[PDB]
């Protein structure tokens, strides 16, 4: 059935929003997150009008709901629509629960304390009969009361009908903008990954403190290999990531303090063995100062460059 | 097919019930479970009345079927419908076999010690001609004999119709609540994940009752990297958790120890270079006791703080 | 189509039949395999009966396939009829190549050496005007000649018409039970699982026969790294069993005697550097034959507990 | 639409071929592999004949395309066709580009020296009004000019038309056997499995050329501890094989071997603390030449025991 | 409905693009990836033709859109029909959004400084009546302006026309190819594989510059450990790759030389040992520049060699 003619040749106006259900896969290697939904689209239309007598009320196939097809989807959307409903004044609002994989890109330049914004693009199939334009529901827009994103904080959610769209589209559609702003909990974080991460390292520094050979390789070495270990514990917890991101710039820091470690660790040893114990103990007491302070400055420059 | 009208005009009940066959899927990465299970379903309609011959007898599309619809699954319902039945009263039950993916969180805060609620919800497709209300049949609600969600005990499995519904919904309607209620045995845990874990950190203390450096700092860092590895080891047990649970508070504490004991044994090794064997000697005696007091110290407050 | 009425008001039987051909999945960790078999119908009906001329043989969908459906499938099974014949005297049969995914459990009290029961089974969709009844077709089922499950020998292979059925069926019916008993070829688990394993524990026990405390507690601890990093390397082979297993009750064991070995050595220490030489040497003396044989009876009662 | 009857009463021959295109999928955990290509078909039929003009040509559904069904797969075949031709001769031959998992064993006896035989089996639906033979078109089946099977090298492709058959199907029916047989190039194995397996045993034996125990025992286990983490690292490239392989054997031997080199190394490091510093020399000279002796000798035994 | 004929018996061009959108997945293991894209096609047809009055415009399977079809697909395209036009003059274009696996081969010869050719393949199926032929529509074919293969660089999106065709196909036809060579950001590589790579073999370096056993051994084979820990914790970037890579020619280069620093070790401390400290100190003091210098012109000669 086509779509009901403007009465005074003006674009249909449909407003569409999104109550999200559950956003169960947030699959970082994927690039991709899949979310279950309520879509509810809302289209004034001169049809079905409703007399004074058993009102309030239809079909699923009967009446003509507008294609609304998302862009950034793996596959077609599957949908299940649960309630078809029109205004007697004219204004036919139904809702449809459905389950789509949505594809997002995920930086994780500031991992673990990233704020990602997750990106649902909408359009409409067009006639020349009508136009159709795209709006926001205010009111029907919103985040689940549930547990909304688990690990995560709903920073904001918001709709923009964004003006621009790809040079394909031979004609000019106005592509809606659904962005969720989402920040994350990275607390659980810094006693996971970060704590034992640098007390892996200042077990490491604890070396200078020494001054056997045979002690303090072993006390070195022995470190670097608890660091690669716990590097590989961790590295579940990060996504692939084909770039620098933010950890993987303090273990790489990390590695250069264990190669620096080694390096005096050795000089010391060549120091005393050749007859040169003043210079050695020189060397080992500047350095046990001079390695976490490093270390600090080495971190907050870090910081700086990716904050 | 219309659902037949009211005679009186009041609201038609169903009773509806679920009897679990497999719950073979737990993916705690995913946050999800996949059960297969016999729906039921009784709806008292004034339709294929039976005379009192040839009885007790139907058709899988001929008879009106009332929309019951999951809420919390990924995709919709891989339904089959195996028995459909009609009593000559007039009270039509149907039996479906039907697999099911379920979306419900599950909360770790107290693994492996954790007792979790499944989630189940129910809704209808309520038509303006007669509105539809759901109840629950105890004599038909159950659980398998059969293995039953085999490492967990079924606490309990209750029903509720809970009139509170999300608010995209314009109309209200009595969404269904199935909640089972799960433990976990948990004996399994204490020799898989817990007492090696303890173990190791005891032959890391055994240091204190020695007194070569270079003996104890392998005797430690050894020992810290065997902790690294159990933990590779364990992580597959536990999932992904972005949050901090009771295990990965148990794990923090260890690493705080083990970078404690490496700390004591550092002073003391600098003490006895120093030429004050006496000091170290007391700070070793004291350590002896106090690590392992300071350790069931801090696992009571750990766990009086999470339970 | 309406089955056939009896001629005498007699129980329809069927005839029915696996011959499995692969059995490729065994997804422990989903407790589930995936099989792919013929499944073979026998129907005795007094339709499309055959004349002395042109005989031998039909359709896929005008003849009355009864509505053989498995109960413990993941979802519902992906057939695909092969053959349909009918004898002349009134004997169809049919046979269908049919791919199902099996949800069956397997424990694993006794891995490797376990001796398990695969379990299908079978129910019919019965009609009033005519019953159904299932048997088995000795002549027909069987096993494949082919790898027939490779790593596992094919124990039995044996049917049984349970009377028993779950509650929820109002009526009663003769659910039918395919149970396949197979146990598993264990010989290349004692090379790839146990004699490695014990390998390290000697290696481990050996520092006995030694005296210098800076090498006990390294050929110690660093074979307990040893054996978590073989338990590492194992854990792909075993599945996820959330339960005492005997692999994970040996493991346990195996954690035990690491932490005894150390203890002793610590305590040897101690008593030799305490100038009690004497004692230090009776206590080493009697744990290089206590320990083996400790390990030795312990395994016995292992074994026995578990057998 | 009925297969045409034979002018003669001769049964019906049709010539079958199969170019492959892919096998991109090559699960070894799941014992299969992922394969698509063009089937071609050739059927002698006397429809549809063509006229000296506009020749040279159809339908994908108004001509009787014989039903050729695969036994060996895990689903149906998903199939395309692509092309439909009829020679005027009465020759119709038409190619469908077909996707299809093969369910085939791949025995790891020789890995990774291994050369395996993927099988494809060919079955049709014969008639009682025309029987159905099948043939192989020697100038049709091929080979892609393509990657084919990388990292394997395609030995043969021939094909056999078996008589035999499983006994479950009543009649005779001639299964056809495409035999696809591959071996490996096993040129990168040598640099990543096996040459670094043999450096750390090396290193584990140049504790011979030493004396100190606290130096033997040191590069013997830690041996010990890299060749289990080199093993970790390698089984991401060995299955799961539950069957002693033969790179399953090489490591047994080398398992064996460390266990020999820590016996040996304390039983000298006993002697020399025994005051029997002769025999302890003997022993250690010994074996130095012992040990790569019978380690060559073992894998000799060894590879003539596998091939 | 039939192709249009042509007026001049000459062959119909298809003007044919793509505009990609999603790239998401690349799954080395599994040597494919899937994208998503505009597919867009241009046929010049005498129908539909447009009246000027209420011009600019139809419907999804009235109008014959040709068949195109793609090659290297694991399974059919899934496809959605977005917009269908028809220009006025007799120019009908649409534009669909397909979701597609693409099956092509990533060579990773020269990993992670690799360059490779993603390919696409388009086919139609040519009709007698009127001969396809395929042409590339320049202002149409581009890429997307997004994420655009995050982590890769887009060096070129090219078509050509390709004569060649399998030999299946009887007839000839114009496959049509369109390739897109991308290179790869190699620079986070730098830091996360190859740089601690290094680090760690330059720790087991150092152990030239000292001169007690029980040191040099230790700081020589824990490094050896600790390579192998992070070429575990690496070969998650790497794809499984069944063929000499070059970073799998580093990685053998650098076991080589960590056997050959273990056995200068051992010949160091077998000279002091013998009373020949003078040799010792030599070879020690020759291998502290010998052991850079050869690697890096080992590293030189790999580079040349492979690039």
């Given at each position: 059935?086509?779509?009901?003619?403007?009465?005074?040749?003006?674009?249909?106006?449909?407003?569409?929003?999104?109550?999200?259900?559950?956003?169960?896969s947030?699959?970082?290697?994927?690039?991709?997150?899949?979310?279950?939904?309520?879509?509810?689209?809302?289209?004034?239309?001169?049809?079905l009008?409703?007399?004074?007598?058993?009102?309030?009320?239809?079909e699923?196939?009967?009446?003509?709901?507008?294609?609304?097809?998302?862009?950034?989807?793996?596959?077609?959307?599957?949908?299940?629509?649960?309630?078809?409903?029109?205004?007697?004044?004219?204004?036919?609002?139904?809702?449809?629960?459905?389950?789509?994989?949505?594809?997002?890109?995920?930086?994780?330049?500031r991992?673990?304390?990233?704020?990602?914004?997750?990106?649902?693009?909408?359009?409409?199939?067009?006639?020349?009969?009508?136009?159709?334009?795209?709006?926001?529901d205010?009111?029907?827009?919103?985040?689940?009361?549930?547990?909304?994103?688990?690990?995560?904080?709903?920073?904001?959610?918001?709709?923009?009908?964004?003006?621009?769209?790809?040079?394909?589209?031979?004609?000019?559609?106005?592509?809606?903008?659904?962005?969720?702003?989402?920040?994350?909990?990275?607390?659980?974080?810094?006693?996971?990954?970060?704590?034992?991460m640098?007390?892996?390292?200042?077990?490491?520094?604890?070396?200078?403190?020494?001054?056997?050979?045979?002690?303090?390789?072993?006390?070195?070495?022995?470190?670097?290999?608890?660091?690669?270990?716990?590097?590989?514990?961790?590295?579940?917890?990060?996504?692939?990531?084909?770039?620098?991101?933010?950890?993987?710039?303090?273990?790489?820091?990390?590695?250069?303090?264990?190669?620096?470690?080694?390096?005096?660790?050795?000089?010391?040893?060549?120091?005393?063995?050749?007859?040169?114990?003043?210079?050695?103990?020189?060397?080992?007491?500047?350095?046990?100062?001079?390695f976490?302070?490093?270390?600090?400055?080495?971190?907050?420059?870090?910081?700086?460059?990716?904050?």
């Amino acid at each position: 059935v086509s779509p009901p003619p403007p009465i005074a040749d003006e674009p249909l106006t449909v407003n569409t929003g999104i109550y999200l259900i559950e956003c169960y896969s947030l699959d970082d290697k994927a690039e991709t997150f899949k979310v279950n939904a309520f879509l509810s689209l809302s289209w004034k239309d001169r049809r079905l009008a409703f007399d004074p007598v058993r009102s309030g009320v239809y079909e699923p196939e009967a009446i003509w709901i507008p294609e609304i097809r998302f862009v950034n989807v793996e596959n077609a959307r599957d949908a299940d629509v649960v309630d078809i409903s029109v205004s007697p004044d004219g204004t036919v609002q139904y809702l449809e629960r459905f389950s789509a994989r949505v594809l997002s890109p995920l930086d994780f330049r500031r991992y673990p304390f990233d704020s990602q914004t997750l990106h649902i693009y909408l359009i409409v199939r067009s006639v020349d009969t009508r136009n159709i334009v795209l709006a926001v529901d205010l009111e029907k827009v919103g985040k689940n009361d549930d547990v909304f994103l688990t690990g995560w904080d709903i920073e904001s959610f918001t709709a923009v009908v964004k003006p621009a769209n790809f040079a394909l589209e031979d004609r000019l559609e106005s592509k809606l903008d659904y962005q969720l702003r989402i920040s994350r909990q990275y607390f659980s974080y810094i006693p996971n990954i970060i704590l034992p991460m640098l007390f892996i390292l200042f077990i490491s520094w604890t070396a200078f403190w020494s001054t056997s050979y045979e002690a303090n390789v072993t006390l070195v070495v022995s470190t670097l290999i608890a660091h690669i270990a716990f590097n590989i514990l961790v590295e579940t917890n990060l996504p692939k990531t084909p770039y620098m991101t933010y950890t993987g710039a303090i273990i790489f820091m990390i590695y250069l303090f264990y190669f620096v470690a080694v390096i005096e660790v050795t000089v010391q040893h060549y120091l005393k063995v050749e007859s040169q114990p003043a210079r050695a103990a020189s060397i080992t007491r500047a350095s046990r100062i001079a390695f976490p302070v490093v270390f600090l400055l080495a971190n907050i420059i870090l910081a700086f460059l990716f904050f």
